[PDB]
Design a protein around this ligand. Structure first.
Ligand SMILES: CC(=O)N1c2ccc(-c3ccc(C(=O)O)cc3)cc2[C@H](Nc2ccc(Cl)cc2)C[C@@H]1C
Length: 119
């Protein structure tokens, strides 16, 4: 019993996740950072909690979260990892920023009170 179905979590899956997934800047974030593929032997030394959209999607779809706040924290971790690891002038930082602005816009219109759904 890791989590529940709530109104806010279904909103995050349908409105937030689907929208970010399809975005033209989403491709670097759809799978975990592969440090071997990218030749970044220090990545896991700097970033201790990797996160990506694929993992968040799996967690949503397998009812992993108990509350929407937990899912929002995973999105935040994905973005913050990017800002912390990469150089300020790297394009990936601008791509993360673009996606995160959309995330915040959609979160501002999330259903206000979280209620467990009968399923
Ligand atoms: C998110 C993040 O912080 N980073 C990240 C993660 C995944 C991939 C990546 C993913 C898939 C492919 C691919 O399928 O070819 C290539 C690169 C790349 C990066 C970033 N590198 C990168 C991004 C865009 C371009 Cl045009 C060139 C290099 C580095 C960073 C660790």
């Amino acid at each position: 019993n890791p989590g529940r179905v709530t109104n806010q979590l279904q909103y995050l899956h349908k409105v937030v996740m689907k929208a970010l997934w399809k975005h033209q800047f989403a491709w670097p974030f759809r799978q975990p950072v592969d440090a071997v593929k990218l030749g970044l032997p220090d990545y896991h030394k700097i970033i201790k909690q990797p996160m990506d959209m694929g993992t968040i999607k799996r967690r949503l779809e397998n009812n992993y979260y108990w509350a929407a706040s937990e899912c929002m924290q995973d999105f935040n971790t994905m973005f913050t990892n990017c800002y912390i690891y990469n150089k300020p002038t790297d394009d990936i930082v601008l791509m993360a920023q673009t996606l995160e602005k959309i995330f915040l816009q959609k979160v501002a219109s999330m259903p206000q009170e979280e209620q467990e759904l009968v399923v």
